Design a protein around this ligand. Structure first.
Ligand code: GDP
Ligand code: GDP
Ligand code: GDP
Ligand code: GDP
Ligand code: GDP
Ligand code: MG
Ligand code: MG
Ligand code: MG
Ligand code: MG
Ligand code: MG
Lengths: 285, 285, 285, 285, 285
């Protein structure tokens, strides 16, 4: 009946159902004393405190314990009364076969969990999966659908390329690259001097003004994500729709490019989710 | 019972049966993840995603894996219920003997294939073959049949000449030339500067306004396709019927010629198919 | 006085001067702590660690920062005492005009650089440029020069065709294709399952026995590089000289072809360099 | 002052001045990257690379862009110092009136051109024109001049007949036929099987041993060029002087004919040029 | 003359010279009455009792009072007679520049100290520094040097990764993680109940059987140190050499991994020291 979309992501989880929103992908099974005060979920006796701790850098995200974050998002989006829903997950455009390993464990499965002590249960009627990037196309404006575009989802570790002709995909590819490698690069020189920073506590430092990131350190990352797309796409052609949070981290610089036709998608952070929302409406409704 | 006509072509496939239409000749056996979203066919365990990828530039088109495109066209034209049909293929006017190598593999053969996952089967009662150009004559209007005409099919790589006297052919020839060489010429100067274009993604660029093709670049191609026909035909004589997609690419210029009597065939893209359709009606029906 | 030849290439750099040799085209500007242990060069304050990192997939290789690799090759080939030399670079056969943008920045220019901390300087008397493929002809044996041959340089991303009549070139063309697309194809299915491989760390895997490349995966690449040469050359004619590293990657299979006269050039990896070496001798000496 | 003779021909250009010689009639305006390496001429901003490309099959050779080949021959025959010369062109024996359209554009005209980058200029004092065949008579030996002969110039597409009584012409005619039609005939069956040959790259194949031309395929061409001369000449009468390159292509067979008196002209390839050379000497000198 | 190697470490000091050995990194400046009975060193009037007390958790170990432990190790390794030696210290692979701040204070410096009341003096001819991990490669067996390996030094707080191709390093990185965080995790739940344990007195408890460490508490730490290496290395590739004491704390579990090729280095505790010993021999001797 109700429909929900969950982009697990590697550093941010983005859910949209009856109530939309997002949070961080950090998950930790470590023991914690002041449980009342964290965001936590206990599934079949194992507890996880979300929003803090490690990052689960594992690739191939159909097996990276996509477990407590999913239920937490389901609880946070819908309400306690809801029992049966329809899930529309978003896997990368190169790992779409892994849905076989994904449906077998979720479809027609009843999940009971605490969600901060207020225990509840939820079932899913049917599961659905879409590739990242492709979904963001549907959220796109009509003016861009007609032409030949190139959805370029710049994730945290995955760049997903989906070249769309007049309402038909042509090229579909994935590249291992994103903001995470940039964070590793920054820490490679920061931790070197005397410090102890890591990939998780390094974006907040830039936000709060401790890491003096030079203007050209972003230019290098731009030219590195564009020296990995030439074999598959010519950006001057194929009017582009930059999406993903990484785009907003470089929006002030992506607009100063020698590209003849392009744009940065509005609400890029939630585009891949909103488009999948439309698609789910089209299918079930 | 039912009749179908399939012009495989080198850059466009054109089929006409219960439901007419066309598509691109691009075929690729490359692995693709998001299979659901492409147009695909799996024959005896080998899969092909049609409409994207390579071009299969091989000449002598009786052996260029005329395999998945044919079945895809058969499925797209007729319906799932249909089992037995009559095929009327169109080989060039110089490769008509190769029908021997063509009939032996198709006549009385049952073909089973997926066609985007909805597996089906089809048999062909008898196979028939006609030369390109000659067939387009039958689709021609009556006013032109009476006179002495010269069907000039300007394909992508083959110019087929069929000189018809009063309902009887006289001269029959094939020339290696067409729009593909023009595309190669354009890329020879475009890719030279800094670019990476190829023969496949170069027509769309002209359509979408990135390649500033000069007016005389078409004039050169016209005079090059006419400096290859003088030995066999004098165009001023033999009222001509330009056909093939290449003609429409030059219709605005072919009409400004110093030729005493000529025309560009209407629906030239599908003339060679419609005429063969009439001929098949005449034979079986 | 001294003469040097440098084929920058896209995945391998090949230099021949007083001391010949080669290395990888990988270049990275990323900060590195243990500088002593890498191969590095600092030019006008920007440092580059060669042999590791990215690949610089940019086409039109007259602008792809052909900068630190060139000086590194110059230092590694000649000795510290040498000051003035003559450079004979090798551009592709379709980008030979870009020498205008190449000579203006190098001719009569003194370059000072570190080369692993032992700072030195070097000047070049005059610059010279030759097209890829054509140069490899001169390294060829006499038995093949007399006839009508077709130098077919199968690079990593560029196939360069130079058809030579009796000591005179006829056809000259470039095609965007090579081993890099094959690596992308392999990773398209390897990274799909659960892995994280990329075009750079994928050949070593084949060498060390982790990627079970099927025998027909090479056959597909052969027939794909031969379905891109028919319009320009008929391989049965024009006795062929396969060159480039890609040929050695397929030497065991290129010899089982239905071609009437052909061969795989010995030391194909360095043929395009040795031939240019002869030509430079002829010109200056 | 100096004198030059230029037989443009349809497949071979033959010039004789201070330095004699010949080359191929192939001309192409197509863009080419490695300009240094071809034989090229740029006239008033349009460039042509001679010796490669198309063939310019147009008849009535007073308008077939007789433009870059002429200047190239002039430059190659004479030297850079020469400024004013006397031209003696050779039109067919049926198109001798077209000299009106030829003199108006050349006489007293200064032509400036590059000739492979070494720009130069040249003027012509007066222009002269002679018919093909007739000129070859003057190069003939004295033993044949006295009698009643029949100059039979077997060109590539034109057979020129000039019947000479005792130093006076009687019959003068032209026939559309020659080696080009034979090449078209050969390709009509070669390209049919699977191949892609054309009239331009088909003689070299015979020379290099790929086309197994049967002995009687030449006999058919002989009897076809002799079934087109009976109405105008009886070959048994009128002791004949076969000239033109086509004769050398059939010299081994023309000598086995049932003709009472005949011969194949020595240096037939250059006879029509040498005779015109004598005539020019007679007129101006 | 004599050579010594000192790995200060964060929880263990490891020295190798004329006499090898190790001890604990605990250092305390606190006053102690029964001085005779402890291991102590007094430098320029400040005394330190080694092997007991605090731990000096400071990172960037080029400034963490690397002072009394160093001299104590020097005295314990060599003998009283020795005056001049050569030091080969081991900094992490990300803090190798700090050698600048290290050499300035030690090179050519005479140090006088008590060493349990028997005052003595020592000078160092020259100082040398190597990165952790890289040094352990030299102690490795020949069978592993030839291949492409990945030295993975699992320290107490630092994981040092050095990817070695055929005798050449490629990737060099440091990660803040190790056994110390595991000890903090254990105490987080032990001290919670009623206890007062700390990171220093918690390993001995496991050894002596008071802390019932579950088998999966080590598995969590394994998967946490492997969820921090995927971005930089794929462990299935790059045959690995686990080193550092942490490896021995998990040797019984590291061998049950789904890794295709790996091993735990013998004498892992002293590998990083022995390899540096070889390197020092190579350089000075
Ligand atoms: N400057 C800026 N950056 C943002 C904002 N929101 C997200 N980002 C960046 O976008 C990245 C999130 O990547 P994400 O789209 O979640 O990757 P995914 O989880 O793999 O899909 C983070 O690294 C952020 O730095 C924002 O509001 N401002
Ligand atoms: N301008 C224009 N060109 C067209 C159109 N349809 C087809 N063409 C051109 O016609 C060519 C197709 O050639 P085709 O007839 O399929 O060759 P064949 O496959 O060998 O028979 C393409 O290169 C197109 O550029 C059209 O609607 N407009
Ligand atoms: N099997 C094998 N392959 C090789 C060898 N050397 C080079 N190659 C292949 O040749 C390719 C190098 O292409 P290259 O000639 O450098 O392209 P270019 O840089 O554009 O000129 C690589 O992808 C290698 O896989 C060899 O010794 N054995
Ligand atoms: N066997 C042979 N044939 C030749 C030779 N030279 C020229 N030919 C033939 O002669 C023809 C040239 O015809 P040509 O006299 O130039 O015709 P034109 O240009 O119209 O005057 C070519 O088709 C060649 O096959 C030769 O040395 N040997
Ligand atoms: N089980 C076991 N563990 C050991 C042994 N020796 C050392 N360890 C562990 O290894 C760790 C020492 O780490 P270390 O290599 O000194 O880190 P570093 O000082 O930063 O280089 C300690 O936490 C010990 O628990 C041993 O013999 N047995
Ligand atoms: Mg994403
Ligand atoms: Mg056609
Ligand atoms: Mg190359
Ligand atoms: Mg002639
Ligand atoms: Mg250590």
């Amino acid at each position: 009946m109700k429909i929900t979309v969950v982009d697990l992501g590697n550093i941010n989880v983005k859910y949209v159902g009856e109530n939309k929103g997002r949070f961080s992908s950090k998950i930790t099974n470590d023991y914690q004393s002041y449980e009342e005060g964290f965001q936590r979920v206990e599934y079949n006796g194992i507890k996880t405190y979300i929003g803090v701790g490690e990052l689960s850098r594992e690739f191939n995200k159909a097996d990276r314990d996509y477990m407590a974050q999913l239920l937490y998002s389901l609880a946070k989006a819908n309400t306690a009364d809801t029992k049966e829903i329809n899930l529309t997950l978003l896997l990368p455009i190169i790992q779409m076969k892994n849905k076989t390993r994904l449906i077998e464990t979720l479809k027609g499965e009843n999940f009971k969990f605490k969600f901060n002590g207020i225990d509840r249960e939820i079932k899913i009627n049917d599961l659905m999966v879409l590739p990242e990037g492709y979904a963001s196309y549907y959220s796109l404006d009509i003016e861009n659908k007609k032409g030949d575009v190139c959805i370029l989802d710049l994730g945290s570790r995955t760049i997903n390329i989906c070249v769309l002709e007049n309402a038909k995909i042509v090229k579909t590819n994935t590249i291992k690259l994103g903001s995470f490698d940039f964070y590793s690069k920054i820490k490679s020189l920061e931790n070197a001097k005397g410090e102890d920073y890591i990939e998780e506590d390094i974006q907040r430092l830039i936000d709060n003004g401790l890491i003096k990131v030079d203007s050209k350190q972003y230019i290098e990352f731009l030219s590195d994500i564009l020296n990995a797309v030439k074999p598959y796409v010519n950006l001057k052609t194929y009017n582009t729709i930059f999406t993903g949070g990484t785009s907003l981290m470089l929006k002030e610089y992506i607009e100063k490019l020698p590209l003849n036709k392009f744009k940065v998608h509005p609400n890029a952070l939630t585009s891949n989710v909103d488009g999948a929302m439309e698609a789910s409406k089209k299918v079930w409704n």
